[PDB]
Amino acid sequence: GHACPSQCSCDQTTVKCHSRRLTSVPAGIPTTTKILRLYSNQITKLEPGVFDHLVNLEKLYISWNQLSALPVGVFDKLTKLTHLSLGYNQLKSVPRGAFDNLKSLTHIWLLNNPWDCECSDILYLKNWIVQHASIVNLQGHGGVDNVKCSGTNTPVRAVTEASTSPSKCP
Ligand SMILES: O=S(=O)(O)CCCN1CCN(CCO)CC1
Incomplete structure:
Protein backbone atom coordinates (compact mmCIF):
# COMPACT_ATOMS: atom_id res chain seq x y z
CA GLY A 1 0.00 0.00 0.00
CA HIS A 2 1.72 3.20 -1.33
CA ALA A 3 -1.03 5.14 0.58
CA CYS A 4 1.73 4.95 3.30
CA PRO A 5 4.90 6.91 2.39
CA SER A 6 7.76 4.40 1.84
CA GLN A 7 9.87 6.30 4.44
CA CYS A 8 7.17 6.02 7.22
CA SER A 9 5.13 3.35 9.05
CA CYS A 10 1.31 3.75 9.15
CA ASP A 11 -0.56 2.18 12.13
CA GLN A 12 -4.14 3.02 11.05
CA THR A 13 -4.60 6.75 11.85
CA THR A 14 -1.11 7.08 13.51
CA VAL A 15 1.67 7.87 10.97
CA LYS A 16 5.25 7.34 12.16
CA CYS A 17 7.72 9.43 10.09
CA HIS A 18 9.92 10.30 13.14
CA SER A 19 13.58 9.42 13.72
CA ARG A 20 14.09 8.54 10.00
CA ARG A 21 16.78 11.08 8.83
CA LEU A 22 14.13 12.76 6.55
CA THR A 23 14.98 16.15 4.87
CA SER A 24 11.39 17.03 3.85
CA VAL A 25 7.88 16.14 4.95
CA PRO A 26 6.97 13.02 2.91
CA ALA A 27 4.26 13.53 0.29
CA GLY A 28 1.21 11.27 0.32
CA ILE A 29 0.59 11.16 4.11
CA PRO A 30 -2.85 9.48 4.23
CA THR A 31 -5.87 11.81 4.69
CA THR A 32 -7.12 9.33 7.41
CA THR A 33 -4.19 10.47 9.64
CA LYS A 34 -5.03 11.75 13.13
CA ILE A 35 -1.49 11.56 14.69
CA LEU A 36 1.60 12.57 12.61
CA ARG A 37 5.07 12.04 14.13
CA LEU A 38 7.78 13.97 12.18
CA TYR A 39 10.12 14.71 15.08
CA SER A 40 13.85 13.93 15.16
CA ASN A 41 14.67 14.40 11.40
CA GLN A 42 16.66 16.87 9.24
CA ILE A 43 13.75 19.05 8.02
CA THR A 44 14.75 22.71 7.46
CA LYS A 45 11.72 23.96 5.47
CA LEU A 46 8.02 23.20 5.14
CA GLU A 47 6.46 23.57 1.66
CA PRO A 48 3.44 25.93 1.67
CA GLY A 49 0.25 23.78 1.81
CA VAL A 50 2.16 20.60 2.84
CA PHE A 51 -0.40 19.68 5.59
CA ASP A 52 -3.53 21.10 3.90
CA HIS A 53 -5.02 17.64 2.97
CA LEU A 54 -4.75 16.38 6.61
CA VAL A 55 -8.18 17.72 7.69
CA ASN A 56 -8.56 14.94 10.38
CA LEU A 57 -5.21 15.74 12.08
CA GLU A 58 -5.34 15.97 15.90
CA LYS A 59 -1.59 15.72 16.79
CA LEU A 60 1.38 17.12 14.81
CA TYR A 61 4.89 16.60 16.23
CA ILE A 62 7.64 18.42 14.27
CA SER A 63 10.09 18.99 17.16
CA TRP A 64 13.82 18.17 16.93
CA ASN A 65 14.32 19.32 13.33
CA GLN A 66 16.15 22.40 12.02
CA LEU A 67 13.06 24.34 10.79
CA SER A 68 14.22 27.92 9.99
CA ALA A 69 10.71 29.31 9.35
CA LEU A 70 7.04 28.41 8.92
CA PRO A 71 5.20 29.22 5.68
CA VAL A 72 2.21 31.59 5.86
CA GLY A 73 -0.99 29.61 6.55
CA VAL A 74 0.75 26.25 7.05
CA PHE A 75 -1.60 25.13 9.94
CA ASP A 76 -4.78 26.90 8.62
CA LYS A 77 -6.61 23.65 7.54
CA LEU A 78 -5.84 21.71 10.78
CA THR A 79 -8.99 22.88 12.66
CA LYS A 80 -9.17 19.60 14.73
CA LEU A 81 -5.57 19.93 16.02
CA THR A 82 -5.21 19.50 19.81
CA HIS A 83 -1.39 18.96 19.97
CA LEU A 84 1.38 20.81 18.10
CA SER A 85 5.12 20.45 18.85
CA LEU A 86 7.64 22.88 17.27
CA THR A 160 8.03 44.98 25.48
CA GLU A 161 7.04 46.13 21.93
CA ALA A 162 9.26 49.25 22.51
CA SER A 163 12.19 46.72 22.66
CA THR A 164 11.39 45.56 19.06
CA SER A 165 11.95 47.21 15.64
CA PRO A 166 10.86 46.23 12.10
CA SER A 167 14.45 47.20 10.99
CA LYS A 168 16.23 44.43 13.08
CA CYS A 169 14.44 41.70 10.98
CA PRO A 170 15.47 39.35 8.12
O1 LIG B 1 8.32 17.46 21.19
S1 LIG B 1 9.09 18.04 22.28
O2 LIG B 1 10.21 17.27 22.71
O3 LIG B 1 9.31 19.57 22.02
C1 LIG B 1 7.94 17.97 23.62
C2 LIG B 1 7.53 16.53 23.92
C3 LIG B 1 6.03 16.34 23.96
N1 LIG B 1 5.62 14.97 24.27
C4 LIG B 1 4.96 14.90 25.59
C5 LIG B 1 4.57 13.48 25.92
N2 LIG B 1 3.67 12.90 24.90
C6 LIG B 1 3.42 11.48 25.17
C7 LIG B 1 2.87 11.16 26.54
O4 LIG B 1 1.69 11.90 26.81
C8 LIG B 1 4.27 13.05 23.56
C9 LIG B 1 4.66 14.48 23.27
Missing part, protein backbone atom coordinates in the same frame (compact mmCIF):
# COMPACT_ATOMS: atom_id res chain seq x y z
CA GLY A 87 10.25 22.50 20.05
CA TYR A 88 13.99 22.16 19.33
CA ASN A 89 14.06 23.92 15.93
CA GLN A 90 15.66 27.06 14.41
CA LEU A 91 12.51 29.30 14.40
CA LYS A 92 13.05 33.06 14.85
CA SER A 93 9.31 33.98 14.76
CA VAL A 94 6.00 32.58 13.52
CA PRO A 95 3.91 34.31 10.85
CA ARG A 96 1.14 36.63 12.11
CA GLY A 97 -1.99 34.55 12.88
CA ALA A 98 -0.17 31.19 12.44
CA PHE A 99 -2.28 29.55 15.25
CA ASP A 100 -5.55 31.42 14.76
CA ASN A 101 -7.53 28.54 13.14
CA LEU A 102 -6.28 26.07 15.80
CA LYS A 103 -9.45 26.55 17.89
CA SER A 104 -9.12 23.03 19.51
CA LEU A 105 -5.47 23.33 20.61
CA THR A 106 -4.87 22.00 24.19
CA HIS A 107 -1.02 21.48 24.03
CA ILE A 108 1.68 23.45 22.15
CA TRP A 109 5.50 23.13 22.53
CA LEU A 110 7.64 26.14 21.53
CA LEU A 111 10.75 25.67 23.76
CA ASN A 112 14.31 25.64 22.45
CA ASN A 113 14.02 27.89 19.38
CA PRO A 114 16.26 30.93 18.79
CA TRP A 115 13.30 33.37 19.02
CA ASP A 116 14.47 36.78 17.71
CA CYS A 117 13.25 39.22 20.37
CA GLU A 118 14.87 42.29 18.68
CA CYS A 119 12.60 41.86 15.56
CA SER A 120 8.91 43.09 15.54
CA ASP A 121 7.89 39.72 13.90
CA ILE A 122 8.11 38.32 17.52
CA LEU A 123 5.03 40.30 18.70
CA TYR A 124 2.31 37.84 17.44
CA LEU A 125 4.07 34.96 19.27
CA LYS A 126 4.54 37.09 22.43
CA ASN A 127 0.85 38.15 22.54
CA TRP A 128 -0.31 34.61 21.68
CA ILE A 129 1.76 32.85 24.42
CA VAL A 130 0.53 35.42 27.02
CA GLN A 131 -3.12 34.79 25.96
CA HIS A 132 -2.63 30.94 25.79
CA ALA A 133 0.08 30.52 28.50
CA SER A 134 -1.90 27.65 30.14
CA ILE A 135 -1.33 25.32 27.09
CA VAL A 136 2.39 26.17 26.50
CA ASN A 137 5.26 23.69 27.16
CA LEU A 138 3.22 21.34 29.44
CA GLN A 139 4.20 17.85 30.71
CA GLY A 140 7.53 18.96 32.28
CA HIS A 141 8.74 21.20 29.42
CA GLY A 142 9.04 24.33 31.63
CA GLY A 143 5.83 26.21 30.78
CA VAL A 144 5.40 29.59 29.13
CA ASP A 145 8.69 31.01 30.53
CA ASN A 146 10.60 28.32 28.54
CA VAL A 147 9.76 30.27 25.33
CA LYS A 148 13.08 32.16 25.46
CA CYS A 149 14.82 34.92 23.50
CA SER A 150 17.99 34.01 21.54
CA GLY A 151 21.21 35.38 23.07
CA THR A 152 19.76 36.37 26.50
CA ASN A 153 17.28 33.57 27.42
CA THR A 154 14.86 36.32 28.57
CA PRO A 155 11.31 34.88 28.47
CA VAL A 156 9.59 36.04 25.22
CA ARG A 157 6.50 36.94 27.35
CA ALA A 158 8.65 39.66 29.08
CA VAL A 159 9.48 41.41 25.72
Whole structure:
Protein backbone atom coordinates (compact mmCIF):
# COMPACT_ATOMS: atom_id res chain seq x y z
CA GLY A 1 0.00 0.00 0.00
CA HIS A 2 1.72 3.20 -1.33
CA ALA A 3 -1.03 5.14 0.58
CA CYS A 4 1.73 4.95 3.30
CA PRO A 5 4.90 6.91 2.39
CA SER A 6 7.76 4.40 1.84
CA GLN A 7 9.87 6.30 4.44
CA CYS A 8 7.17 6.02 7.22
CA SER A 9 5.13 3.35 9.05
CA CYS A 10 1.31 3.75 9.15
CA ASP A 11 -0.56 2.18 12.13
CA GLN A 12 -4.14 3.02 11.05
CA THR A 13 -4.60 6.75 11.85
CA THR A 14 -1.11 7.08 13.51
CA VAL A 15 1.67 7.87 10.97
CA LYS A 16 5.25 7.34 12.16
CA CYS A 17 7.72 9.43 10.09
CA HIS A 18 9.92 10.30 13.14
CA SER A 19 13.58 9.42 13.72
CA ARG A 20 14.09 8.54 10.00
CA ARG A 21 16.78 11.08 8.83
CA LEU A 22 14.13 12.76 6.55
CA THR A 23 14.98 16.15 4.87
CA SER A 24 11.39 17.03 3.85
CA VAL A 25 7.88 16.14 4.95
CA PRO A 26 6.97 13.02 2.91
CA ALA A 27 4.26 13.53 0.29
CA GLY A 28 1.21 11.27 0.32
CA ILE A 29 0.59 11.16 4.11
CA PRO A 30 -2.85 9.48 4.23
CA THR A 31 -5.87 11.81 4.69
CA THR A 32 -7.12 9.33 7.41
CA THR A 33 -4.19 10.47 9.64
CA LYS A 34 -5.03 11.75 13.13
CA ILE A 35 -1.49 11.56 14.69
CA LEU A 36 1.60 12.57 12.61
CA ARG A 37 5.07 12.04 14.13
CA LEU A 38 7.78 13.97 12.18
CA TYR A 39 10.12 14.71 15.08
CA SER A 40 13.85 13.93 15.16
CA ASN A 41 14.67 14.40 11.40
CA GLN A 42 16.66 16.87 9.24
CA ILE A 43 13.75 19.05 8.02
CA THR A 44 14.75 22.71 7.46
CA LYS A 45 11.72 23.96 5.47
CA LEU A 46 8.02 23.20 5.14
CA GLU A 47 6.46 23.57 1.66
CA PRO A 48 3.44 25.93 1.67
CA GLY A 49 0.25 23.78 1.81
CA VAL A 50 2.16 20.60 2.84
CA PHE A 51 -0.40 19.68 5.59
CA ASP A 52 -3.53 21.10 3.90
CA HIS A 53 -5.02 17.64 2.97
CA LEU A 54 -4.75 16.38 6.61
CA VAL A 55 -8.18 17.72 7.69
CA ASN A 56 -8.56 14.94 10.38
CA LEU A 57 -5.21 15.74 12.08
CA GLU A 58 -5.34 15.97 15.90
CA LYS A 59 -1.59 15.72 16.79
CA LEU A 60 1.38 17.12 14.81
CA TYR A 61 4.89 16.60 16.23
CA ILE A 62 7.64 18.42 14.27
CA SER A 63 10.09 18.99 17.16
CA TRP A 64 13.82 18.17 16.93
CA ASN A 65 14.32 19.32 13.33
CA GLN A 66 16.15 22.40 12.02
CA LEU A 67 13.06 24.34 10.79
CA SER A 68 14.22 27.92 9.99
CA ALA A 69 10.71 29.31 9.35
CA LEU A 70 7.04 28.41 8.92
CA PRO A 71 5.20 29.22 5.68
CA VAL A 72 2.21 31.59 5.86
CA GLY A 73 -0.99 29.61 6.55
CA VAL A 74 0.75 26.25 7.05
CA PHE A 75 -1.60 25.13 9.94
CA ASP A 76 -4.78 26.90 8.62
CA LYS A 77 -6.61 23.65 7.54
CA LEU A 78 -5.84 21.71 10.78
CA THR A 79 -8.99 22.88 12.66
CA LYS A 80 -9.17 19.60 14.73
CA LEU A 81 -5.57 19.93 16.02
CA THR A 82 -5.21 19.50 19.81
CA HIS A 83 -1.39 18.96 19.97
CA LEU A 84 1.38 20.81 18.10
CA SER A 85 5.12 20.45 18.85
CA LEU A 86 7.64 22.88 17.27
CA GLY A 87 10.25 22.50 20.05
CA TYR A 88 13.99 22.16 19.33
CA ASN A 89 14.06 23.92 15.93
CA GLN A 90 15.66 27.06 14.41
CA LEU A 91 12.51 29.30 14.40
CA LYS A 92 13.05 33.06 14.85
CA SER A 93 9.31 33.98 14.76
CA VAL A 94 6.00 32.58 13.52
CA PRO A 95 3.91 34.31 10.85
CA ARG A 96 1.14 36.63 12.11
CA GLY A 97 -1.99 34.55 12.88
CA ALA A 98 -0.17 31.19 12.44
CA PHE A 99 -2.28 29.55 15.25
CA ASP A 100 -5.55 31.42 14.76
CA ASN A 101 -7.53 28.54 13.14
CA LEU A 102 -6.28 26.07 15.80
CA LYS A 103 -9.45 26.55 17.89
CA SER A 104 -9.12 23.03 19.51
CA LEU A 105 -5.47 23.33 20.61
CA THR A 106 -4.87 22.00 24.19
CA HIS A 107 -1.02 21.48 24.03
CA ILE A 108 1.68 23.45 22.15
CA TRP A 109 5.50 23.13 22.53
CA LEU A 110 7.64 26.14 21.53
CA LEU A 111 10.75 25.67 23.76
CA ASN A 112 14.31 25.64 22.45
CA ASN A 113 14.02 27.89 19.38
CA PRO A 114 16.26 30.93 18.79
CA TRP A 115 13.30 33.37 19.02
CA ASP A 116 14.47 36.78 17.71
CA CYS A 117 13.25 39.22 20.37
CA GLU A 118 14.87 42.29 18.68
CA CYS A 119 12.60 41.86 15.56
CA SER A 120 8.91 43.09 15.54
CA ASP A 121 7.89 39.72 13.90
CA ILE A 122 8.11 38.32 17.52
CA LEU A 123 5.03 40.30 18.70
CA TYR A 124 2.31 37.84 17.44
CA LEU A 125 4.07 34.96 19.27
CA LYS A 126 4.54 37.09 22.43
CA ASN A 127 0.85 38.15 22.54
CA TRP A 128 -0.31 34.61 21.68
CA ILE A 129 1.76 32.85 24.42
CA VAL A 130 0.53 35.42 27.02
CA GLN A 131 -3.12 34.79 25.96
CA HIS A 132 -2.63 30.94 25.79
CA ALA A 133 0.08 30.52 28.50
CA SER A 134 -1.90 27.65 30.14
CA ILE A 135 -1.33 25.32 27.09
CA VAL A 136 2.39 26.17 26.50
CA ASN A 137 5.26 23.69 27.16
CA LEU A 138 3.22 21.34 29.44
CA GLN A 139 4.20 17.85 30.71
CA GLY A 140 7.53 18.96 32.28
CA HIS A 141 8.74 21.20 29.42
CA GLY A 142 9.04 24.33 31.63
CA GLY A 143 5.83 26.21 30.78
CA VAL A 144 5.40 29.59 29.13
CA ASP A 145 8.69 31.01 30.53
CA ASN A 146 10.60 28.32 28.54
CA VAL A 147 9.76 30.27 25.33
CA LYS A 148 13.08 32.16 25.46
CA CYS A 149 14.82 34.92 23.50
CA SER A 150 17.99 34.01 21.54
CA GLY A 151 21.21 35.38 23.07
CA THR A 152 19.76 36.37 26.50
CA ASN A 153 17.28 33.57 27.42
CA THR A 154 14.86 36.32 28.57
CA PRO A 155 11.31 34.88 28.47
CA VAL A 156 9.59 36.04 25.22
CA ARG A 157 6.50 36.94 27.35
CA ALA A 158 8.65 39.66 29.08
CA VAL A 159 9.48 41.41 25.72
CA THR A 160 8.03 44.98 25.48
CA GLU A 161 7.04 46.13 21.93
CA ALA A 162 9.26 49.25 22.51
CA SER A 163 12.19 46.72 22.66
CA THR A 164 11.39 45.56 19.06
CA SER A 165 11.95 47.21 15.64
CA PRO A 166 10.86 46.23 12.10
CA SER A 167 14.45 47.20 10.99
CA LYS A 168 16.23 44.43 13.08
CA CYS A 169 14.44 41.70 10.98
CA PRO A 170 15.47 39.35 8.12
O1 LIG B 1 8.32 17.46 21.19
S1 LIG B 1 9.09 18.04 22.28
O2 LIG B 1 10.21 17.27 22.71
O3 LIG B 1 9.31 19.57 22.02
C1 LIG B 1 7.94 17.97 23.62
C2 LIG B 1 7.53 16.53 23.92
C3 LIG B 1 6.03 16.34 23.96
N1 LIG B 1 5.62 14.97 24.27
C4 LIG B 1 4.96 14.90 25.59
C5 LIG B 1 4.57 13.48 25.92
N2 LIG B 1 3.67 12.90 24.90
C6 LIG B 1 3.42 11.48 25.17
C7 LIG B 1 2.87 11.16 26.54
O4 LIG B 1 1.69 11.90 26.81
C8 LIG B 1 4.27 13.05 23.56
C9 LIG B 1 4.66 14.48 23.27
